[PDB]
Amino acid sequence: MREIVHIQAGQCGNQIGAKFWEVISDEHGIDPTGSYHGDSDLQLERINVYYNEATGNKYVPRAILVDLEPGTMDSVRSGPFGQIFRPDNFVFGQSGAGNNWAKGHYTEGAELVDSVLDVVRKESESCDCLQGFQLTHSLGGGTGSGMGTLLISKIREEYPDRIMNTFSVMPSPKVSDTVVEPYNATLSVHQLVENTDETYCIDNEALYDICFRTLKLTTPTYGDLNHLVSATMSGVTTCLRFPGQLNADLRKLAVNMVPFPRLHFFMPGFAPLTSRGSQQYRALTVPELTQQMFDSKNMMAACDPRHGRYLTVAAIFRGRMSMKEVDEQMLNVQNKNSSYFVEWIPNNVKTAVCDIPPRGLKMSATFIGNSTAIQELFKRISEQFTAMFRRKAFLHWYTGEGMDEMEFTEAESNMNDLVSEYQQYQDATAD
Amino acid sequence: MREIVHIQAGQCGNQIGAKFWEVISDEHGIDPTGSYHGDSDLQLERINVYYNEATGNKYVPRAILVDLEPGTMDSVRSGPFGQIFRPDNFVFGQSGAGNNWAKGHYTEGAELVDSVLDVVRKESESCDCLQGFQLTHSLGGGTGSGMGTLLISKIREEYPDRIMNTFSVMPSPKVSDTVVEPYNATLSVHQLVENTDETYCIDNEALYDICFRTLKLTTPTYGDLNHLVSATMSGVTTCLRFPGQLNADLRKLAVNMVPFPRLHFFMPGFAPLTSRGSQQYRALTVPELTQQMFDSKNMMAACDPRHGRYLTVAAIFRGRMSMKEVDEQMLNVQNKNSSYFVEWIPNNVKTAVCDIPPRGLKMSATFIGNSTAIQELFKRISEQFTAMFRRKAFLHWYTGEGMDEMEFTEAESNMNDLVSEYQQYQDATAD
Amino acid sequence: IVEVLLKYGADVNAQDKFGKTAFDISIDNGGSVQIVYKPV
């Protein structure tokens, strides 16, 4: 029954992974003990995608929790829903990665990886028909970045015919001052380009700017940043968790969204944007929903969608609304904004509508775009990487772990190639 | 024209190799400058087997001189024929192998091997039709044993379809007190069993006993020991160096002598045994030569031929003598001593007669026997090896070079297997 | 910056808790046979 295995690695991966489970649990009527208490049958129809049914009619997330930082286990277990997670699915080390990709990928991470693979093997074999995997992690640290990409690679060896999907948090010096974050992110992107089928680019630069400029928060905290992350993750997974026709599984989503294998980095967006504690006085109209979710101020990646073209788009509308009005509005943005949509992929914008809205909203909309403007995110990381790399800055922290400088050169070149490929398709014409 | 490439490694290999060249150059009428001044066309007919013809009608040995020990190049170059050798064919290193097989095979020897391979490649390609290779070396030291067996293995990779022949000096505590010699010899035998086509076992135990008991030398020197070595090497290479019907090349010798690939360790014998400076008052008769070359007191390996069976024998008579009398004597020793000859290899004793005798002798005889009694030599080494190996004695000198203890176990087991194979054929019947 | 620190009296021999000086770090960051004919 199309099961997904969820994996959360590192401090960021576990923080956003926990919020994902707290949020989707509420939507499905599942309390922290695993009991169901809802009104709608749509809540449990596809509960199997993310939850295992344990004895006593309980539901337990098909989630594996990983971190080299031992202290992460306590913070996850102490969360509102820490009780729901399978105890044996918590795999924690004693020595962290110290913001070092090489430690997470090659040394401390490699020491712990077989313990994680044992637990993913067990969840995977228990599946009636496994779809693939979903990894939440950051790219700026050491565990989520290095060990997360090591896990992806090992999982790909045993399950090569399954979808590998990630929620990858991109670093921004606006939220983190760690000097080596561009190194860790470039090394991770190199891995993601080769080994994932679809990746959602949750950019800390866009999240900080949404909180500061749009939500008017003088100093956004990780809670503020993560409110946007969970709201995004709920929206982008709605099609997988509820009964529907379009993009109902990770494979059908990838066939619709990815025309060229490497070009699988999605720009997520949502509407209405809200802060924690902001009440909704009235529901947005379908034209407000459609206009806002396509707005650059609503994107979760710091890229201007009007600086590129949309290869493909998935629009998900949640709540009770007119489908005729939705269709009209979706045709309206494409006909009015025709120059930001590739003309050589006919009917590249697919729209789904789910009757169940998210918490505190009567109407909402989530956007998923595969845009050539995503090169703005990669160019920003590449520039930061190059500034340090030309000075051979901080390399001993990586080569001291056994790494070769040639790996940095290879990763830089691969990400720069990815950027040229987006530009090639942006300039392509339907001759 | 059936060329042989000669290689001499280590202090023993270079000492024995220089004596080989001094002896066969005298037999072929070649002086230390490479000029010919002989009295028989038989001396020049097959000169090409061991000598290259340089410009100016000069003859130069197709010999490569190798050592890791500092100071050895001068002693070789200063020898009676040191100037006949090709200057570029001398490969002498700075750091010796310190009686350590691991140092000669894996570390210092491996650092010098490509320089030797360059020079063997050049001699080999210059060959109109290369037969194979001849290596002189000891098994008890570090260079001849370790580096000699490394050379054999590398030469086998480039020239796998060529004959690999060695004159391997076995160690005896009667002539050397080095504690690790059984280790070096066992590690070398393991290599020889797999990688040579034919090996002449020149045993220092037999050489010392011949000098002490037969020649009546209270304290045999290496010169005394090598006087027997040179006499043997001259005799066993006669068929290769002079015109004849039998065993005229290394390959035809192997087809006649080796029924089973691993059983290629020969026990050489020669008559008459003499010391340096001992004049021959009268030439021996054909029955005296036949009786003596087959006698245990005339064997160059410390094995009793009446404790095993002869798989194959090559007898070479040198001098002017009756061929009818030689044939009669060869049939008589086989019919009188029928129980020491395998009955399942019909006509296994081949006899050649060369008109040219060795220096200072009117008549001589050389014996090459592939006898199952050679297991006495291997058992003696195995017992010495085991006494130290069970105590894990001196292993750090070998494992300190990167070696694994498992390689000692593998070598011991292989040599013990070789001994069981000789015993199996010793007990075989023509049922 | 290494230069201005040195001109303001920075100790070049100063080792970190890993036993490394500042120049050891920059070096860490930075990443045959000879035929001799001898007469005898």
Ligand SMILES: Nc1nc2c(ncn2[C@@H]2O[C@H](COP(=O)(O)OP(=O)(O)O)[C@@H](O)[C@H]2O)c(=O)[nH]1
């Ligand atoms: N959005 C978000 N980013 C986070 C969070 N925690 C850490 N990060 C980012 O992740 C990076 C550091 O990686 P982290 O997950 O702390 O390291 P790891 O434990 O070694 O995987 C930096 O770019 C942080 O700004 C979080 O809760 N939310």
Ligand SMILES: Nc1nc2c(ncn2[C@@H]2O[C@H](COP(=O)(O)OP(=O)(O)O)[C@@H](O)[C@H]2O)c(=O)[nH]1
């Ligand atoms: N017959 C004989 N044995 C020798 C001679 N020189 C050394 N050996 C033996 O060879 C062994 C030592 O090996 P050696 O050739 O000296 O060492 P290498 O230079 O490391 O190869 C001991 O068993 C010695 O008795 C020699 O001139 N004649």
